[PDB]
Design a protein around this ligand. Structure first.
Ligand code: HEC
Ligand code: HEM
Ligand code: HEM
Ligand code: FES
Lengths: 379, 98, 106, 81, 64, 241, 26
């Protein structure tokens, strides 16, 4: 070759994973969440860096600081409400991502699946510390009760909760830590994303049918660049619709109140993206039992590869799992509901059966259904 | 919390057994007139409200747990009673929690 | 002792077969298989006719999927015509490997 | 390695395509959508909608009870007696 | 001036009349058996709601 | 565990996506806060920047901000010798410091109104239905004098003196100062101190909606332009067989 | 779209009404 810009630079060749790559034809709209996933990572970052261009990480000021970003600073208001709302999107997008993987068996790509999982959990940490930066009543308490929930561990716990906090409570020491880790996680996560992409590039994108498409492959540039741009267009739409018309709507927490360590919103809860795991935790009387089961909520993802029982990696051709897949999703919705519920009889009893349903759906029902379907097909 | 000859007795006459947790007021303080508690209801620990409840003690709005005057669990869903931080009375006006 | 029960499974079977949509796509059961290392070798063992067939079928199928269009009612795969053409090939491949595994015990 | 010349082996298939500039990008969209949208939704509805329906009942009932049991402050045990 | 009139009207509707009967018995039950733990507040809490839904819509057209 | 009554979706000029804030209301409301409310509740993030937000001129608010620094002035902030003039000063703190504040109101601590609308669950509805909601304690109920009964407080009891009562103040123009009429204006000024961007953001909304209605359709066509070859595509299979 | 978006993000740095308030006022 001569003057083929792409492979001339070696660097520019590495970018031909976007333009020249084999991309399956058939492909639900669901896959745009990968790309959007990145979109969100880049938006949070640009946004973060500007907010962290006018934010301070002290008890005294932090609330003020945010308050000042939203008042005196030019276009700081949208930047901040764009950053808050974004993170919602970021999660809304994440959970589409994992749904798709669950449903079409994209998770067969074990190595890719394991990175995903790390991805998911890393963002999860990020979101947990950022929300505490503004140091408002919800944030303040939410950190205590989550962090303390780590003191369940018998031997260490206790010592360890105190190291993480940098003291006995959550004063300045903790507050500056979260500021620093919030800042540096996303950068580390981008490396991961790319590592994730790396592995995925070695086997390409699965499809709704569930079969290899090698016999049908398309230009990523021609087709999938417009799709992705279009995806954006809708993604942004949702992010501005939220951010411009209903800034606070999705941000359940109304606690714009500077944190007073004796005061407490009897209704303490993580934002929507954490409710599942909250609910699941409450269902267990015992503290430690609840922390294990909380971890297992999320950490149970990496099992599913091994659970796979059918011969069709595609759920597309299998009824019964399509029914229990949906139910889990609706069980997951049910759990999210509990999250914002008084912890009383009505909700308790419900959550408890939802938390068993979720683990049944994942651990026991689906796997059996797999088998059955295989046996009805005579496979 | 600086109690009262009327308050001490109050908490003194309460029949242990019928207390979720069995805690003599005397095993939870050092010097009767005084009672010092770590304001963290045991349940999910969001601060109680002294002078609230049904057992003349402390209330934790958060979920409906009443705490007596010695601050002993009497209406759940709290698990245990209130903790009593470490503290030695040094001079007659001085006690050091910790 | 299966006369009534196992002559009625075909009833759920039949139900189930057309339930799963792949019927409609013009695809067959063997073409819906998870392409793993054994399937892979079976696949490779196919004659030109069988094997090119499985390529057009999947071509026509992924085309439909891309366009969200179902094949006409007249042109659909009928359960009574279960070409289990991979099965023969696929069995052996497994058979060979089970042996290999076993021979490696001690 | 190389992803385009090395995917698989395909014999005897013709394809026929047309240029963008020769065709229309919106092919009787209302007409296809209705019938296609209709035909897949109706093959989805049964497999998808149920569990959501279920949640709704459980939501509804589940909130009624709460308000009752709590607003029915006399619910547990009556007043007169 | 404005608020005070509209409120009345609102409690003149067949559903306000109907659910005020619980208030009336409440008040008397409670006042006569004054030692009871019965809350008349809780009873009032239904009336108020229906009065106020109404109030809002109308009350608004009368202010500046 | 007491039922809490909830606020009506009270008819507001701004309830609607495009609806915006009514400054005259703001204006009025302001005074309400300043005369009725400055006494025990503070507004720390609010400067004397109503100018354009509240239609008070620069000269108007300068003057309005000057007298507030003459009486409550920077002597309460720590500017020993400070008097009339300045505009960077923030609304004057009812009391030196919180602890005081609770003493003046006996244990209770007058919440900073800056964000009340956006703080407390339930927005300006709650705030309006609190002030305008004050009814007779319920048969068989007891009330410590401070504990006035209010139909909309969580715990069913608030330490609030006559928030607002008819003819509490008088507005320049002549707006009929009804308990409620004044509340409608007081809330509105709160809405705004809570979210000063209210109007700009709804504006942009408008411009983001039009734009997006031009880009969404456009961009979709692009997407079909390109893909068309694929979708229009037809296939043939001719083995030698 | 890009123009305003970018512009907002750069003015976010230009000069905060906080500071600018005191500017030119002595
Ligand atoms: C002193 C005389 C006050 C004036 C004038 C106003 N408020 Fe007030 N308010 C005051 C106290 C002491 C308290 C505490 C209540 C308690 O029981 O702790 C309050 C409370 C409020 C609330 C309640 C919010 C909540 O805690 O749930 C609101 C919404 C409120 N104050 C707003 C408010 C407004 C808008 C006023 C002017 C129109 C106003 N208050 C006047 C004391 C005083
Ligand atoms: C996806 C990765 C990230 C996510 C999920 C995320 C999420 C969040 C959330 C939920 C908040 C709380 C905001 C609120 O509700 O007030 C927040 C705040 C903040 N974040 Fe991010 N963020 C991410 C990346 C970043 C990055 C990369 C930076 C810096 C470059 C950053 C800087 C900040 C700052 C300074 C705040 C504090 C002020 C505020 O509340 O806006 N964040 N983040
Ligand atoms: C930081 C968050 C993430 C980013 C930026 C990201 C990005 C991407 C992108 C750009 C793609 C290719 C397109 C697509 O299929 O949609 C992809 C594919 C994939 N991702 Fe993610 N991802 C993230 C999170 C996750 C999570 C949490 C998991 C699972 C636990 C996951 C698992 C997968 C899988 C299995 C695929 C391949 C599917 C297929 O095409 O067959 N991803 N990811
Ligand atoms: S956190 Fe105190 S009773 Fe529940």
């Amino acid at each position: 070759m001569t003057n083929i810009r792409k492979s001339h630079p070696l660097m520019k060749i590495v970018n031909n994973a976007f333009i020249d790559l084999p991309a399956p034809s058939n492909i639900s709209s669901w896959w745009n969440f990968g790309s959007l996933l990145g979109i969100c990572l880049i938006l949070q970052i640009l946004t973060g860096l500007f907010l962290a261009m006018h934010y301070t990480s002290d008890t005294t000021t932090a609330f003020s600081s945010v308050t000042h970003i939203c008042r005196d600073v030019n276009y700081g208001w949208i930047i901040r409400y764009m950053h808050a709302n974004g993170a919602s999107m970021f999660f809304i997008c994440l959970y589409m991502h994992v749904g798709r993987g669950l449903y079409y068996g994209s998770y067969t790509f074990l190595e890719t699946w394991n990175i995903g999982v790390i991805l998911l959990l890393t963002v999860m940490a990020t979101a947990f510390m950022g929300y505490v930066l503004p140091w408002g009543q919800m944030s303040f308490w939410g950190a205590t009760v989550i962090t303390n929930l780590l003191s369940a561990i018998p031997y260490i716990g206790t010592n360890l909760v105190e190291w993480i906090w940098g003291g006995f409570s959550v004063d300045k020491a903790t507050l500056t830590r979260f500021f620093a880790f919030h800042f540096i996680l996303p950068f580390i996560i981008m490396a991961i994303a790319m590592v994730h992409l790396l592995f995925l590039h070695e086997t390409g994108s699965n499809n709704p049918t569930g079969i290899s498409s090698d016999v049908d492959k398309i230009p990523f540039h021609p087709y999938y660049t417009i799709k992705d741009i279009l995806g954006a267009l809708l993604l942004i739409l949702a992010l501005m619709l939220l951010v411009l018309f209903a800034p606070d709507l999705l941000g359940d927490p109304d606690n714009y109140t500077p944190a007073n360590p004796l005061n407490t919103p009897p209704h303490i809860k993580p934002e929507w993206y954490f409710l599942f795991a909250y609910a699941i935790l409450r269902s267990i009387p015992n503290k430690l039992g609840g922390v294990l089961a909380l971890a297992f909520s999320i950490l149970i993802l990496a099992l599913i590869p091994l659970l796979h029982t059918s011969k069709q990696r595609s759920m597309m051709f299998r009824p019964l799992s399509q029914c229990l897949f949906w139910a889990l999703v609706a069980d997951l919705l049910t759990l999210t509901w509990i999250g914002g519920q008084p912890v009383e009889h009505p909700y308790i009893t419900i959550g408890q059966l939802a938390s068993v349903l979720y683990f049944l759906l994942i651990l026991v029902l689906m796997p059996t259904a797999g088998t059955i379907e295989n046996k009805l097909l005579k496979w | 919390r600086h109690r009262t000859k009327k308050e001490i007795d109050q908490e003194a006459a309460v029949e242990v057994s019928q207390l979720r947790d069995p805690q003599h007021d005397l095993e939870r303080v050092k010097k009767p007139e005084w009672v010092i508690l770590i304001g963290v209801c045991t349940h999910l620990g969001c601060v109680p409200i002294a002078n609230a409840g049904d057992f003349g003690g402390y209330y934790c709005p958060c979920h409906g747990s009443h705490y007596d005057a010695s601050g002993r669990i009497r209406k759940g869903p709290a698990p245990l009673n209130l903790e009593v931080p470490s503290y030695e009375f040094t001079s007659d006006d001085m006690v050091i929690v910790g | 002792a299966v006369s009534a029960s196992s002559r009625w499974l075909e009833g759920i079977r039949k139900w189930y077969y057309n339930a799963a949509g792949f019927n409609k796509l013009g695809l067959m059961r063997d073409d819906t298989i998870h392409e793993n290392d054994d399937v892979k070798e079976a696949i490779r063992r196919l004659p030109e006719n069988l094997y090119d067939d499985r390529v057009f079928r999947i071509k026509r199928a992924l085309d439909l999927s891309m366009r969200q269009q179902i094949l006409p009612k007249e042109q659909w795969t009928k359960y009574e015509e279960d070409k289990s053409y991979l099965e023969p090939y696929l069995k052996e491949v497994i058979r060979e490997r089970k042996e290999r595994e076993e021979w490696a015990k001690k | 390695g190389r992803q385009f010349g090395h995917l698989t082996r395909v014999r005897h298939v013709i394809t026929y395509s047309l240029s963008p500039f020769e065709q229309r990008a919106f092919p009787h969209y209302f007409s296809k959508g209705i019938p296609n949208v209709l035909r897949r939704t109706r093959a989805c509805i049964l497999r998808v909608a149920p569990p959501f329906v279920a949640f709704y009942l459980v939501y509804t009932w589940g909130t009624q009870e709460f308000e009752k049991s709590k607003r029915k402050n006399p619910a547990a045990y009556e007043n007169d007696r | 001036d404005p608020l005070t009139t509209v409120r009345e009207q609102c409690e003149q509707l067949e559903k306000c009349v109907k659910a005020r009967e619980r208030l009336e018995l409440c008040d008397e039950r409670v006042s006569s058996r004054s030692q009871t733990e019965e809350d008349c507040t809780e009873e009032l809490l239904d009336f108020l709601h229906a009065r106020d839904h109404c109030v809002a819509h109308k009350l608004f057209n009368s202010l500046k | 565990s007491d039922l809490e009554l909830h606020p009506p979706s009270y008819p507001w000029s701004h309830r609607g996506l495009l609806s915006s804030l009514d400054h005259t209301s703001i204006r009025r409301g302001f005074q309400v806060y300043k005369q009725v409310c400055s006494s025990c509740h503070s507004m720390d993030y609010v400067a004397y920047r109503h100018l354009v937000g509240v239609c008070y001129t620069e000269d108007e608010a300068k003057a309005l901000a000057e007298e507030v620094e003459v009486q409550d002035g920077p002597n309460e902030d720590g500017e020993m010798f400070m008097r009339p003039g300045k505009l960077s000063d923030y609304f004057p703190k009812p009391y030196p410091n919180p602890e005081a504040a609770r003493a003046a109101n006996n244990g209770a601590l007058p919440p900073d109104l800056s964000y009340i609308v956006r703080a407390r669950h339930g927005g300006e509805d709650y705030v309006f239905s609190l002030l305008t909601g004050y009814c007779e304690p319920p048969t068989g109920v007891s009330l410590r004098e401070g504990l006035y009964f209010n139909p909309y407080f969580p715990g069913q009891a608030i330490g609030m003196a006559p928030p607002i009562y008819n003819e509490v103040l008088e507005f320049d123009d002549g707006t009929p100062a009804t308990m409620s009429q004044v509340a409608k204006d007081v809330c509105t000024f709160l809405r705004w101190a809570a979210e000063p961007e209210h109007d700009h953001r709804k504006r942009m909304g408008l411009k983001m909606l039009l734009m997006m209605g031009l880009l969404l359709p456009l961009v979709y066509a692009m997407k079909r332009h390109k893909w068309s070859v694929l979708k229009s595509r037809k296939l043939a299979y001719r083995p030698p067989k | 779209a890009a123009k305003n978006v970018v512009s907002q993000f750069v003015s976010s740095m230009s000069a905060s009404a906080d500071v600018l308030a005191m500017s030119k006022i002595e």
